[PDB]
Each structure stands twice: as C-alpha cells, then as structure tokens.
Structure 1
Amino acid sequence: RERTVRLQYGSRVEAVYVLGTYLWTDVYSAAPAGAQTFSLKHSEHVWVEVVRDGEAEEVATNGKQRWLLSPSTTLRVTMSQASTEASSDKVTVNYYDEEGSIPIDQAGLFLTAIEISLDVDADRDGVVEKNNPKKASWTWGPEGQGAILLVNCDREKVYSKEDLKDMSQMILRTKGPDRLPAGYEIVLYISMSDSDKVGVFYVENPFFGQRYIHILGRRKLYHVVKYTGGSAELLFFVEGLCFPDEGFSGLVSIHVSLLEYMAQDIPLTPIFTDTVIFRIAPWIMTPNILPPVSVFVCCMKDNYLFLKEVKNLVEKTNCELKVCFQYLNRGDRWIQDEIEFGYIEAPHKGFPVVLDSPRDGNLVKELLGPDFGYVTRSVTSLDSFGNLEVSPPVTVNGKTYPLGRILIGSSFPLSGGRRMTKVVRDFLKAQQVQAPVELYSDWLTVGHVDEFMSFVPIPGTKKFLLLMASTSACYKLFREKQKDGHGEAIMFKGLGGMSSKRITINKILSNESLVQENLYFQRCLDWNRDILKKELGLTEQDIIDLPALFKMDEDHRARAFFPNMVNMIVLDKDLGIPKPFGPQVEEECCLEMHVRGLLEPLGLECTFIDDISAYHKFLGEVHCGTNVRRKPFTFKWWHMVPSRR
C-alpha cells in the first residue's frame, strides 16, 4: 500500500503516516528553479530510499550523498513503529545549484506515525485477532475466513455490557503519541444500504461510566471516534438486523477512516481507510435425526389421552415436555403449523431461533421461554410450517449437503395450483446452506408435506430412512385380511360418532370410486418419491412405506381417511405414532401391527398416541400438534461451500 506525499515548494509538509503503508515522495517539484542536485537527512526511525528509475537505494540518517534532480528520481519513506512524545520523525531534503556545495534551499517532511486497525474475529475462533489480513473478504469453507454476525432476534438509549453480550465484537486498535496532529479525525462509517442491516454500539463517554450508545445503523451512517494516545483499544459491539433474503446476500461492511481537514466547505480527505466485512449467520432447520431437547405439544385442555400418552412417551426419553393450550389467534395445530424451531450460530455463540407465523397475527409470545430468539412475520394452507421439512445430511452426485436440504410442498409449474408465498420461499433459499427442494403437496386438501412423509434415524447407525405414506400398502393389507376372513372387521372402534357408518374392511374395499381416488393419490405420492430419491440421493433401500388412506374432496384433493401415521414424533429410537384406529383383528389394530412389523426389526420403538378420541370421530382433521426442539448440527455452517448463487 503505497501512498503519495509531495514535498512542498516553499514550505514544510507535515503528515500522518499509518503503519502498514509507505510513502513515495516527489522531491523534484519542491526544488527551486535552476537547482541541479539534492541531498537528504532523516531521523532514526524513518527509513528512506532514493529510487532512481525504479532502482532503490537505502540512505543514511546523515550522509553527504548527492543525486541529480529528476522527475524519475524519488524517495520511498517507511516507518516500522508508531511515534511517541519522544519522537521527532522527519526527512529533510537540501537542494543545490550547479555551482557550489552550500544548499540554496531546503524542503522537509515531518511525520507522525500511528497504528490504526479495525479488527474482528475473521479466523472464526471467538477472539478478535490483530489485523487479520483477510478481514476485508468473506470466504466459505474449512479454510475460509471472515467475521460472523448474529441477527438480534430479541424484539437513543443506553445499554450495559450485559445487554450486548450476544453481539459480535469489533475492536479499533491504535498506537501513537498523545494526540493526532492538527486537522485529523477518525471516523467509523457504513453505507446507506447497510444501514438497515446492522447496528453498532459503543461507549461514547467512558469517563461517565460505560453506557453503550447506538452509533451506527438506521439514520446514523458515521460516527466520529475520539483518539486516545499511547496503545489503545476501542470496543464496539455489532448486531445484524435481518437474515439474508431476496436482494440481501448477508454481507455487510464497516469502515474506519482517518480524515484530513482541508478547509471550510471542502470535504475532508480520506487519508487511510480500513475495512472489515461480516456475514450475517443464516437461519438453519433441524432434521429428525438430531438429538431431541424439548418436546412441545398443543391441544385442548381436555384431550386427556393425548396428554397422558405423550407424557408417557417423553418419559421414556431424557427430553423435557412443554405443554401448551389453544389460543384465540391460532389454529389447533399451531405449535406444528405456526412455529418452526431452527438455530443460528456464530463462532462465539449460538442459540435456537423460532420462526412465528400466527394465523390471525400476534396479540406477548414468550411463553416459549427466554432461551429462544424469536422472529415473527393472501396466504394459503401451503404457507404453514406443516409444509416445511428438512432432510438429514445427504450426498447427491458427489455434492455434500452437510446440513441436509429443506423440503417445501408446492404444485406442478403449469398447474395454476397453490404455492407457498414467494417471500417465504425466497427467505429459505437465501439462507443457502440448506439448498431447498420443492415437492408436490398440492394434491392434499391441506397441502402439507408432513401429511405424506417423514424421516427417522436407524438406531445404532449413522443412517436414516424416508417414511412415505402408501395407499397401495393399505389396500394390500386390507385385501389380505379380507381373504383371511376378516372382511367384517370394523374401523374406528371406540369413536362413537363413527359407529353409525359401520365402516369395515369389506365396505372400504367395495367402494369403487374410493379405490380409483386412492390409485391417483398413490401416483401423487410416487411422483414425490421420485423427486426425493433424485434430490436426496436415496435408493429403495432407504424408504419404508406406511399404509395410508385418503378421501377426495371437490377439488380432487386428499384428506386423511384415518389418521396419517407418517406424521410422528421422532425422538431417536422412540416414535410417537398417531393411533390409526384401524380394523381390529384378534383384538389388535391391524394397522398398528403392520407398522410394528416394519419398524421394530430396525430397533425403532413404537408408541401409538391417541389424539382423536376426545372428539369421538375423525373427519380428516387433527386438533393437536407437536414440535421437537433439537440440538444443532455439530458441523459448522461456515465450513460448507455452497454453489455460486
């Protein structure tokens, strides 16, 4: 970093020198007319080279050497240490005419050397290293570098060092004498565009106590920073205001400049500028294979079997159970549909962050606990978080997705069908590290991917399975039981509001239109199976089909005939599975027995959970919801190398 400083014809030049740079100095312009040669002297801590046509020669502090004056003969000036009060740092040039050895004039350069570095933790260990030479760039991957910012997820003032504890540190390190020379100041600044992406806090007046003031952000694009002599550090705390999105990459920049005062009405000159970049950490979703921490449940207060059975399930684990009831502004599934658990992470810190999309809007929301960051937002059913899932880590065609891939239900491109809102799809895409895939959920009345699919770990391995609803599996099973003489076996036993229908296996198998409707739904399921296999790199060995059955509405879309078992609580080996209420054979539900026969040999332990008995019947709607909060991946997101956007 070479900087231009010219000796002034007929005056001394005084300049601040910033360590890490060096000066090239024109001595030729300040030479009086008619002068021929020049010599120079300089102080102990200034290094001076004479550079003639690109060839550099170090010069002593007081020599008598002379050089011909010439536009192509210049000085190179460097200093390796900042000035103190004991410093007189200078270079003096004397000029000579053709005749005689006594100087006819002299021009000089008086220097004050200071160290200025805006430092961040670019090497991502949680401590702010000195002047990381890569701090002005942000690169992905294990060898990648540059500092990370967390969004402030907790929804002109004064803050202590406690309130800012979760933000990122940025330190302005300086070294120099008691004061900057006359006409200089130091200024921290950001662009107008970044002003809604970040905020920066600082103690403006530490003699009055440490009261952190917001100095950069909305409406404040610059802040003059007071210079302290000697070795000094100013500590700033930095927060992100928003996640990456359509139009925002996640990258922001903060600058510090030493500015020189020219004159009134003249802008100040940026003598030196140092830049750090941050990337705001993306919101990341947790798949079913990650260790469960807490199980969240919502239901009506009187659904007693559901609560007892969920509690019994969780007691088999080390998880905590959190019970929530219904609310005026929210659907009956809201803990599943309106709330999504995810996390954010920086080298120094991370925490869980909940996305909230209340049906009727927000009316206070925690009630979820202080441990969570919280982010709240013409909508269709496809906008629900029931329509959002994420796969376990996969590798596809040699490309690794170490954080898994987000799955979103949609309709065929030319179908004119429903689609999750663009703003939410754009958000998920912009987080980049989960590389989302759209599935086809629009053949379902409600239109949620969690109605037809889920993932479970295979106990005692690092592998997993895709679970798919299958109508073909159900028809096969019922046809077998009928052939076995079980055709009169009744479903919905114990649901009094279903009894008059007297639904048996025979009655189901003889309903011709229902058969055709379910062949079609199987085609819809299989279309998904194929996308999942392609985009997750799965084979048929990775998939288990659970029996399901649907009825068709007037839009030709599906709703559950009996509860969808695939939407289940996965806590490692233990699975809470919705109780299907299937046909009773030998006083056991043939659906429950079939599912156990598929899952148990893999060491998966099945517990059927009754969420419908309290309602006396089942019309395709479930009035309860569950959500599991999980430990984040061990893999650090910033070690991923995502495809070029």
Structure 2
Amino acid sequence: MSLQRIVRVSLEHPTSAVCVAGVETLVDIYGSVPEGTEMFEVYGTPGVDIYISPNMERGRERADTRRWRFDATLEIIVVMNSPSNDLNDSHVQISYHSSHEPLPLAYAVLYLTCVDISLDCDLNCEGRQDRNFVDKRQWVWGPSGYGGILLVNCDCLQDLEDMSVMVLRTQGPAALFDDHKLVLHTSSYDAKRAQVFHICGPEDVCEAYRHVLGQDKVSYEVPRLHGDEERFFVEGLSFPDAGFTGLISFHVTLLDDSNEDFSASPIFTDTVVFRVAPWIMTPSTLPPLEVYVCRVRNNTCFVDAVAELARKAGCKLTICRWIQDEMELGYVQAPHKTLPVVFDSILGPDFGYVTREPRDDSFGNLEVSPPVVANGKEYPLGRILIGGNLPGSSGRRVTQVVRDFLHAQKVQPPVELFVDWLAVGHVDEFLSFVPAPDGKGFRMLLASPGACFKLFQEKQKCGHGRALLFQGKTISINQVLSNKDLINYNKFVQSCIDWNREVLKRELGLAECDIIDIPQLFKTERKKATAFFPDLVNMLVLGKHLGIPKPFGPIINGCCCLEEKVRSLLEPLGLHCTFIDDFTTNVCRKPFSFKWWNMVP
C-alpha cells in the first residue's frame, strides 16, 4: 500500500528499471526540463497504469488522456500489476511540449521490467483482521490479531509436520535473475532461535531440504530451482524466556547488482513474522486423555484403582524418578496442530520436550487455575500458581530460570502462594479445582482444619464422640478435640491456608460461594505441616470423576464420617467420588477451546 519507489529518467538517453507488481513507482526527471517547457504528456504500453497526483494531495488521476500544464509539484505514478515475460517488454514515454513548437521539445523514455516478489506464510487471518490491511512486519495479539505461528519441538528425519511453511513467489523474466540477487535473510539474534530449510529436489527425499538459514547463516541467495515458487520450512529452536520476546522475522531482499562499476542497491523487501507458541498448562477442569503412573511391586492396588477410575472417565491409562514431582505436562498450539510438551528440570511420539537448568526443587510447586476474570483483566487460559518461599529464606523452592520462563510465556500470569508451612510444600496438598455446572464453571477446594473441627464438634454433640479414626493406633473424636496442642496447631494451619485463600480470591476473582472447605487435619513434622489423616484435597480429577485419598475417618452408623462429608459436599455438583487407598501421578489433558493467539495480554 504505502510502498513507493522513485525512478528518474534522462532526456539524453533511455532509462531502464525494474518494478515490483504491487509497488507504485514515482517517475521524476534527473536534470532540467527543456528550455521553454509549458506542457507534458505521458504514454505507456498496455499494462502500465499511469497517474498524476499533486505531491501534497492524496488521490490519483489518470494521466494518458490529457496534456497537462507543467508543474514541478506533480508526481507521475506508474503501476504494473502483472509481471513481465521479457526484459523491458513495457515502456513509458514523457513528452515535453511548448505552445509554439508543434513537435515535442524532448522525449524521456523509461523501459520497465515487472517482477512479482512475495514472501508469505500462514498468517492465521481467517476472521480476525480483514486482509489487504495486514502489515506483514507485525504480529498482533487479540481476536483482531494476525501473524505466523511457530512451534518448538525441543528446547533431521521426517518430522517436518510441525515446521511452518514459507513461500517465496518470484515471478519474472529469468534473465533478470542473473543480474539481480534474491537474498533471504534474518537477524543474528533470530538466527540463534530458529532455522530454515529450503527444499531443493524431490519432495519425497529426506535430504532435499538444505539447511539454508542457520545459527551463523544469516543470509542466503535463493536460486529459482523450481521456477517462480520456492518453499522453506521454518523450525523454532527456543521457547520464549526472559531474554526472548518470541518473535522471529525473515526478510527477502531484491538487490540490483547490474552496475559492475557501482555498488549493489536494494529494490524491494518483503517480510514475514513468526511468534513462538507459548507453553500452556492444563488445569484439573480439562478433560483427560492419558493418565501416567509409576508403580512398584507393592503399589499394585493404587494402580488398579486409578485404572478403574480412568476407565469410568473414558481416559486411558499408561504405566512407566517421578512423573508428578520432577515433570510437568503442558501443550503448545497452532492452527494446524496441538502438540503436548513436557517440561523437565519415552512417553509418546507426538510429544515435545523443554528444560531449563539453573544459572548458579519439585514441580509440585506449580499448578494452574481455570479461566478467570480479576482486576478488570481476563485470563482465558487461567493463571499459574507458584508456591514460593518466604522472604529471607535460605533455600529457594523455584529456581529463577523457571520463574523467568513462566513469566515469558505470559499467557497465564502466575500468582505466588505461601507454602513454607508445609513439610513437602506442594500446592496440591491444600488446593484443588473441580468442575462445577453453575457459578464460574468450577469450584476451588481448599483444605480446612476449621471445617474438620466444626464437623467433629457436631458429631460429638450428636453422641458419636467416641467413634474411632483409622479403624480399617486408632484415635477417637473426643481425643482429637481434647488435644489442645493439635487443635491450636490446626488453627495455625487454618490461618496459613487463609492467607492463600485471600490471595487466590483476589488474584483469581473468586467469591466465597466459589470455594469449598474440605475438612482436613494436620500434625507437625517437623515444625512444618503434614497430613493427620490422608489428605482429601490432594485428589485426582478425571473429568466428572474424582479419585480422593481414603481418609479412614470415624465410623458412624456404618459409614465413614469424612467420606460422607466429602460426598455431601462434592456429589451435588455432579462429580462421582471414589476413595482410593494410598496409605497402605500426572495427567495429560485436552487443550483449551480458547486459542492463545486470540488472547490480548
């Protein structure tokens, strides 16, 4: 649209120039006009649209139908929308006229060769930005955005189904391209984070893709081995980190090098912009696909129970140093493919890998919230939850490189949580998310010593104060309620959880009606918190199915009081509760229906 190029003509000899199919050319004179010039005419061959326009005013007016009065502020604009078949097969002639001489005072001839040069990719502009207004040099976020998407499989076999396509259309006379260079280039910065293979030869061969744009390879002269269309495959090599915005740009430049005694000069430049697909976490509220477990010779009942739960949930089960402590499952998305990526600090053919080593703990310190709205901002991919450490602590629970990575994804702005009060220190010990039909589409389950205190008091006042826990050393409800140290420590734990409750309500925009307090007691090991009875909140969420650790609570009228309380709290929301014996894992999930490129961060 806005591209225009100046080409000057000489009265003493013809000029010859190359023009691009889209770009319009300003045709001015190099030197004085004839002596008594008062008027001028412009003529052109079929296919060269000529227009007159004041240089101050917008709007074009046709030129080849009238003799115009000479004005220095008038611009002649030439457009060739169609490429040329032979060099200089079109021309323009400016004739200068006086009111006295019948014949023209002087001719100025400009022969033109039209070439069509275009570098394009998959811009992902279905219904987001009305095309023909897409600045190819930009990548725009939001539902009104556009731009190329680039995936990253690992941070030379047949694995190009994840690479992005890049088409270089160069339609023009062949002879022109033994005089003019076509340089595909990229910055030294972008070269270290992505590579480009040009296909040269049969498409079926695996080594026909030549490594043309690499780590030190920042420029490459493109040979037109396939006529007027060359194909490149772009492979992303780095995820966005603290020092990488995620944008990768490639340019094509046409270089006039015809003048042997002069220097080469640019004629045209086209650009495509790829953004690296961020790594997105999957909350518990998403549908599962494959559960991954690691078992031993004695853990043969937990696996049977989790397999039964996966069967009832439609999910599939696979068996396999921990898959839930040193390993996280997320996904990268692109219009043509969604690839699950593992983050580490084997499990599938369609699986990518990413890792960051510290520059100098466990991944239970990382969770993710369902989509929320808070502080006016909308988080349609949810927010990451990072259990940090208290200011001034010696040990660090999450390395700085992982924090930088998660913040550089920026599609799930993280929230720090207080977990130093726990023995292990995982957020799943006190926090969970389950699907709910009404409300915000889910419920946030928080461990609550206060809820268990209230329930035990209610059961004691109902005469069942002597019911025993750990029935299937046992302890009664009365002995727990009368243990002053236990109750006071659980009040402290309740306040610790209240801090996180307020933080989560503020940052996730949650209301009290969105929270459910699961009764859960704790004890001290060692000056930190561990579960008194098996942690009910640290459950497994497979859609509407819940694998809840069996608490072995008091037995009243032949039913576990804690199991029945958790049923009373969770079943009216459509979930089916299963209590798994773990006293005697990771889930891969489906991507969000919301596309991350539609988000405006």
Contact (CA 8 Å) 1:345, 1:351: kept in 2 or not? yes
Offset of residue 306 of structure 1: 1.0
Q: Counterparts of 2:44 and 2:592 in 1: how far apart (Å)? A: 60
Q: Counterparts of 2:373 and 2:215 in 1: how far apart (Å)? A: 42
Q: What is the DSSP-based 3-state SS (H/G/I as helix, E as strand, rest coil) of the residue aligned with 1:635?
A: coil
- The structure-2 alpha-carbon separation of the partners of 1:511 and 1:354, relative to structure 1 and needing over 3 Å to count, comes to same
2:581: which partner in 1?
A: 610
1:563 aligns with 2:534: yes
Q: Counterparts of 1:46 and 1:585 in 2: how far apart (Å)? A: 94
Q: Counterparts of 1:74 and 1:285 in 2: how far apart (Å)? A: 57
1:619: which partner in 2?
A: none
Question: Quick one: which amino acid aligns to residue 508 of structure 1?
Answer: V
1:627: which partner in 2?
A: 586
Deviations 1:584-630 (A, max 9, x none): 445543322222222223332211111221xxxxxxxxxxxx22211
Deviations 1:566-592 (A, max 9, x none): 011112221101122334445543322
2:272: which partner in 1?
A: 276
**How does 1:111-260 map onto structure 2 within 5 Å?**
111-125=112-126, 133-153=134-154, 162-180=158-176, 183-205=179-201, 211-227=208-224, 232-260=228-256
- The structure-2 alpha-carbon separation of the partners of 1:4 and 1:540, relative to structure 1 and needing over 3 Å to count, comes to same
Offset of residue 99 of structure 1: 8.9
2:505: which partner in 1?
A: 533
Deviations 1:472-531 (A, max 9, x none): 12223334444555555444345xxxx4xx544444334333322221111010111111
**How does 1:517-528 map onto structure 2 within 5 Å?**
517-528=489-500
Select 1:639's aligned residue among 571, 592, 598: 598
1:387: which partner in 2?
A: 365
Contact (CA 8 Å) 1:473, 1:547: kept in 2 or not? yes
1:620: which partner in 2?
A: none
Q: Counterparts of 1:169 and 1:503 in 2: how far apart (Å)? A: 67
Offset of residue 445 of structure 1: 2.0
Contact (CA 8 Å) 1:186, 1:227: kept in 2 or not? no
- The structure-2 alpha-carbon separation of the partners of 1:227 and 1:527, relative to structure 1 and needing over 3 Å to count, comes to same
Can you give the 5+ residue segments of structure 2 that lack an aligned partner in the other structure? Answer: none
Question: Quick one: which amino acid aligns to residue 406 of structure 1?
Answer: I
**How does 1:425-444 map onto structure 2 within 5 Å?**
425-444=403-422
Contact (CA 8 Å) 1:175, 1:229: kept in 2 or not? no
1:552 aligns with 2:524: yes
- The structure-2 alpha-carbon separation of the partners of 1:445 and 1:74, relative to structure 1 and needing over 3 Å to count, comes to same
**How does 1:72-91 map onto structure 2 within 5 Å?**
72=73, 75-85=76-86, 88-91=89-92
- The structure-2 alpha-carbon separation of the partners of 1:35 and 1:236, relative to structure 1 and needing over 3 Å to count, comes to farther
Q: Which is worse superposed, 275-284 or 173-182? A: 173-182
Deviations 1:538-593 (A, max 9, x none): 22211111121222245x32122222110111122211011223344455433222
1:46: which partner in 2?
A: 48
Select 1:316's aligned residue among 312, 315, 335: 312
2:423: which partner in 1?
A: 445
- The structure-2 alpha-carbon separation of the partners of 1:83 and 1:209, relative to structure 1 and needing over 3 Å to count, comes to farther
Q: What is the DSSP-based 3-state SS (H/G/I as helix, E as strand, rest coil) of the residue aligned with 1:180?
A: helix
1:60: which partner in 2?
A: 64
Q: Which is worse superposed, 506-515 or 522-531? A: 506-515
Q: What is the DSSP-based 3-state SS (H/G/I as helix, E as strand, rest coil) of the residue aligned with 1:336?
A: coil
Question: Quick one: which amino acid aligns to residue 639 of structure 1?
Answer: N
Q: Counterparts of 1:389 and 1:207 in 2: how far apart (Å)? A: 43
Question: Quick one: which amino acid aligns to residue 376 of structure 1?
Answer: T
Q: Which is worse superposed, 539-548 or 99-108? A: 99-108
The normalised TM-score by structure 1 is: 0.83
- The structure-2 alpha-carbon separation of the partners of 1:506 and 1:257, relative to structure 1 and needing over 3 Å to count, comes to same
- The structure-2 alpha-carbon separation of the partners of 1:627 and 1:263, relative to structure 1 and needing over 3 Å to count, comes to same
Q: Which is worse superposed, 139-148 or 567-576? A: 139-148
Q: Counterparts of 1:597 and 1:207 in 2: how far apart (Å)? A: 62
Q: Percent identity?
A: 52
Contact (CA 8 Å) 2:87, 2:113: kept in 1 or not? no
Q: Counterparts of 2:593 and 2:412 in 1: how far apart (Å)? A: 15
- The structure-2 alpha-carbon separation of the partners of 1:484 and 1:97, relative to structure 1 and needing over 3 Å to count, comes to closer
Q: CA RMSD in A?
A: 3.3
Instruction: Work out the number of aligned pairs and report it.
Output: 591
The normalised TM-score by structure 2 is: 0.88
Deviations 1:229-259 (A, max 9, x none): 97x3222222222222212222221111111
Contact (CA 8 Å) 1:180, 1:227: kept in 2 or not? no
1:514: which partner in 2?
A: 486
Select 1:3's aligned residue among 5, 28, 31: 5
Q: What is the DSSP-based 3-state SS (H/G/I as helix, E as strand, rest coil) of the residue aligned with 2:507?
A: helix
Offset of residue 272 of structure 1: 0.5
Offset of residue 215 of structure 1: 1.6
Can you give the 5+ residue segments of structure 1 that lack an aligned partner in the other structure? Answer: 325-329, 358-365, 614-625
Deviations 1:264-304 (A, max 9, x none): 69763221001111111111111122111112222323212
Deviations 1:407-427 (A, max 9, x none): 111244567774522211221
- The structure-2 alpha-carbon separation of the partners of 1:209 and 1:392, relative to structure 1 and needing over 3 Å to count, comes to closer
- The structure-2 alpha-carbon separation of the partners of 1:108 and 1:308, relative to structure 1 and needing over 3 Å to count, comes to same
- The structure-2 alpha-carbon separation of the partners of 1:409 and 1:15, relative to structure 1 and needing over 3 Å to count, comes to same
- The structure-2 alpha-carbon separation of the partners of 1:465 and 1:178, relative to structure 1 and needing over 3 Å to count, comes to same
Q: Counterparts of 1:269 and 1:421 in 2: how far apart (Å)? A: 50
1:623: which partner in 2?
A: none
Offset of residue 116 of structure 1: 1.1
Q: Which is worse superposed, 191-200 or 100-109? A: 100-109
**How does 1:299-378 map onto structure 2 within 5 Å?**
299-324=295-320, 330=321, 334-357=322-345, 366=346, 368-377=347-356
Deviations 1:299-346 (A, max 9, x none): 32321221222222222221111122xxxxx2xxx2211222211111
- The structure-2 alpha-carbon separation of the partners of 1:229 and 1:91, relative to structure 1 and needing over 3 Å to count, comes to farther
Deviations 1:348-400 (A, max 9, x none): 2112222123xxxxxxxx1x111222223398xxx422121111222235532
Q: What is the DSSP-based 3-state SS (H/G/I as helix, E as strand, rest coil) of the residue aligned with 2:152?
A: coil
Question: Quick one: which amino acid aligns to residue 2 of structure 1?
Answer: Q
Q: Counterparts of 1:75 and 1:313 in 2: how far apart (Å)? A: 76
